[PDB]
Design an enzyme around this catalytic site. Structure first.
Site, PDB file in Angstrom:
ATOM      1  N   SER A  45       1.183  -2.138   0.435  1.00 59.24           N
ATOM      2  CA  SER A  45       1.323  -0.919  -0.366  1.00 59.24           C
ATOM      3  C   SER A  45       0.753   0.352   0.269  1.00 59.24           C
ATOM      4  O   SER A  45       0.988   1.455  -0.238  1.00 59.24           O
ATOM      5  CB  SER A  45       0.746  -1.107  -1.782  1.00 59.24           C
ATOM      6  OG  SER A  45       1.643  -1.899  -2.547  1.00 59.24           O
ATOM      7  N   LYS A  48       2.913   3.473   0.706  1.00 59.44           N
ATOM      8  CA  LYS A  48       3.314   4.334  -0.403  1.00 59.44           C
ATOM      9  C   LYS A  48       2.755   5.755  -0.331  1.00 59.44           C
ATOM     10  O   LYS A  48       3.287   6.669  -0.965  1.00 59.44           O
ATOM     11  CB  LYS A  48       3.023   3.638  -1.751  1.00 59.44           C
ATOM     12  CG  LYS A  48       3.875   2.359  -1.866  1.00 59.44           C
ATOM     13  CD  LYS A  48       3.390   1.393  -2.953  1.00 59.44           C
ATOM     14  CE  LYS A  48       4.236   0.117  -2.911  1.00 59.44           C
ATOM     15  NZ  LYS A  48       3.741  -0.878  -3.898  1.00 59.44           N
ATOM     16  N   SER A 105       0.055   0.467  -7.280  1.00 59.68           N
ATOM     17  CA  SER A 105       0.880  -0.329  -6.370  1.00 59.68           C
ATOM     18  C   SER A 105       2.140  -0.851  -7.047  1.00 59.68           C
ATOM     19  O   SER A 105       2.603  -1.949  -6.747  1.00 59.68           O
ATOM     20  CB  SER A 105       0.093  -1.502  -5.755  1.00 59.68           C
ATOM     21  OG  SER A 105      -0.889  -1.006  -4.864  1.00 59.68           O
ATOM     22  N   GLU A 141      10.428  -3.450  -1.291  1.00 56.05           N
ATOM     23  CA  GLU A 141       9.608  -4.406  -2.043  1.00 56.05           C
ATOM     24  C   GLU A 141      10.518  -5.491  -2.601  1.00 56.05           C
ATOM     25  O   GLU A 141      11.633  -5.180  -3.036  1.00 56.05           O
ATOM     26  CB  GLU A 141       8.897  -3.709  -3.200  1.00 56.05           C
ATOM     27  CG  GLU A 141       7.895  -2.648  -2.763  1.00 56.05           C
ATOM     28  CD  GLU A 141       6.622  -3.242  -2.201  1.00 56.05           C
ATOM     29  OE1 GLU A 141       6.540  -4.479  -2.056  1.00 56.05           O
ATOM     30  OE2 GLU A 141       5.692  -2.454  -1.904  1.00 56.05           O
ATOM     31  N   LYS A 209      -5.887   4.287  -0.864  1.00 57.30           N
ATOM     32  CA  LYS A 209      -4.713   3.487  -1.229  1.00 57.30           C
ATOM     33  C   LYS A 209      -4.896   2.122  -0.601  1.00 57.30           C
ATOM     34  O   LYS A 209      -5.242   2.018   0.576  1.00 57.30           O
ATOM     35  CB  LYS A 209      -3.414   4.109  -0.698  1.00 57.30           C
ATOM     36  CG  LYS A 209      -2.175   3.240  -0.983  1.00 57.30           C
ATOM     37  CD  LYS A 209      -1.799   3.310  -2.461  1.00 57.30           C
ATOM     38  CE  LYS A 209      -0.816   2.215  -2.885  1.00 57.30           C
ATOM     39  NZ  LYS A 209      -1.527   0.980  -3.257  1.00 57.30           N
ATOM     40  N   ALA A 212      -2.108  -5.411  -0.461  1.00 59.66           N
ATOM     41  CA  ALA A 212      -2.332  -6.843  -0.323  1.00 59.66           C
ATOM     42  C   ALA A 212      -0.996  -7.503   0.031  1.00 59.66           C
ATOM     43  O   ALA A 212       0.054  -7.114  -0.491  1.00 59.66           O
ATOM     44  CB  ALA A 212      -2.877  -7.425  -1.666  1.00 59.66           C
TER      45      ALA A 212
END
Lengths: 265, 165
Positions: A45, A48, A105, A141, A209, A212
């Site tokens: 993440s 992002k 996230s 994703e 930020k 995982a």
């Protein structure tokens, strides 16, 4: 209390993993401390922040509005989407999607935003445009978190990520309003408690930020400093360890704690 | 007390008030407003880069509004995940919930989200199922073999899978 590189060596030994770290002066861009800084790590993440950087760039150019409402469907929903799944019936604004992506996230929020900037290829083109020739997004994703060993897809290096964050948050490239907004979303991060925030001294600033992924992948990118003002960028990534989440979080926090303890040493 | 759990999720029911939900969930686990509008969102254990969670939607913002929507991630495990890419490919749009389950496996699924937009009528009920292969589910990490099957009025409208066989 160990020096940062001592702590990193202890962590790799204890985890059997690989750590990547950069500590960069925010004002000057100088690299202060580095470890495996040219090795690739899955972004998870952490991508992002770059994503919403590209979104704000479009806003600055008059090609996007944070208030624009995006409507989506069941097809668009993927795992780890607590905010976007709630708003399925109503839609969300671009700005609301960036807030969810960064602070929580939210995966589907990120996929919806990714489509506005040309997908993974489009985001990668944005990186190339701002002079990052290393960082790449290849997948959406949730596959981008797969972290297969040696896979270059969806990776950055600590050096490239640190430079890119500096560019997005402090360079000419985004407007003042956009820089403040990107930074504010990072300040409002909700899922980073167990990492640098857990060892951050009273009175310090942090904006961050996290990420995982599979196969032990874990990371954080952060701006922090004393006297409630950002002074440095810290990027810490972990890959290739079978260790528990608790242990991985503790090691990242420990590396952060070492950087803080040795801040002026 | 504890954080949000599968047991608490199951005990919370459609038709409950906000206070009822908060009393079972444990108010310290829950939030409303902000990113969640007038729904109540309750955190479970840490999972991945977030938390297992439940989200409860209500018929309106009124104090006496009732739960018309339940969603959860990683609060419940599938009974006997036997889903496979093969069985997934047998599932077709237009199928009944019964037909779909018979196909993917009767213990392969959990309820991701279920919403009654005309509560107490069932008209327009939307249902998303999260279904898993034998080792696909994870309550703390990442799925390794799962599918999203979604329905309106109990009829399949679409399907999507990740990592199957």
């Amino acid at each position: 209390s160990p020096q940062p590189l001592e702590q990193i060596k202890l962590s790799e030994s204890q985890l059997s993993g690989r750590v990547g770290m950069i500590e960069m002066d925010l004002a000057s861009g100088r690299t202060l401390t580095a470890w495996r800084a040219d090795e690739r790590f899955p972004m998870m993440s952490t991508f992002k922040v770059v994503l919403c950087g590209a979104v704000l760039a479009r806003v600055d150019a008059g090609d996007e509005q944070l208030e624009r409402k995006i409507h989506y469907r069941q097809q668009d929903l993927v795992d780890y989407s607590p905010v976007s799944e709630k708003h399925l019936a109503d839609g969300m604004t671009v700005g609301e999607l960036c807030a969810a992506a960064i602070t929580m996230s939210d995966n589907s929020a990120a996929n919806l935003l990714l489509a506005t900037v040309g997908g993974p290829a489009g985001l990668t083109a944005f990186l190339r445009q701002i002079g990052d020739n290393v960082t790449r997004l290849d997948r959406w994703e949730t596959e981008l978190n797969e972290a297969l060993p040696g896979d270059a897809r969806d990776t950055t290096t600590p050096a490239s990520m640190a430079a890119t964050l500096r560019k997005l948050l402090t360079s000419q490239r985004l407007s003042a309003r956009s820089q403040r907004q990107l930074l504010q979303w990072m300040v409002d991060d909700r899922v980073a408690g167990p990492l640098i925030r857990s060892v951050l001294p009273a009175g310090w600033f942090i904006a961050d930020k996290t990420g995982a992924g599979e196969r032990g992948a874990r990371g954080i990118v952060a701006l922090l400093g004393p006297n409630n003002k950002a002074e440095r960028i810290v990027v810490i990534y972990l890959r290739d360890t079978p260790a528990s989440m608790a242990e991985r979080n503790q090691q990242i926090a420990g590396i952060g704690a070492a950087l803080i303890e040795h801040w002026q040493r | 007390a504890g954080v949000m759990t599968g047991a608490k999720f199951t005990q919370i029911q459609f038709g409950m008030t906000r206070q009822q939900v908060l009393d079972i969930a444990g108010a310290e686990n829950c939030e409303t407003g902000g990113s969640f509008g007038d729904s109540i969102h309750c955190r479970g254990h840490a999972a991945g880069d977030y938390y297992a969670y439940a989200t409860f939607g209500f018929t309106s913002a009124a104090a006496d509004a009732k739960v018309d929507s339940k969603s959860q991630m990683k609060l419940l495990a599938p009974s006997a995940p036997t889903l496979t890419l093969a069985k997934f490919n047998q599932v077709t749009v237009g199928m009944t919930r019964a037909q779909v389950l018979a196909t993917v496996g009767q213990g392969s699924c959990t309820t991701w989200s279920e919403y009654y937009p005309a509560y107490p009528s069932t008209a327009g009920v939307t249902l998303s199922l999260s279904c898993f292969d034998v080792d696909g589910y994870s309550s703390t990490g990442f799925y390794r073999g799962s599918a999203h099957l979604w329905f309106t009025d109990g009829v399949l409208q679409g399907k999507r899978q990740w990592d199957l066989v």
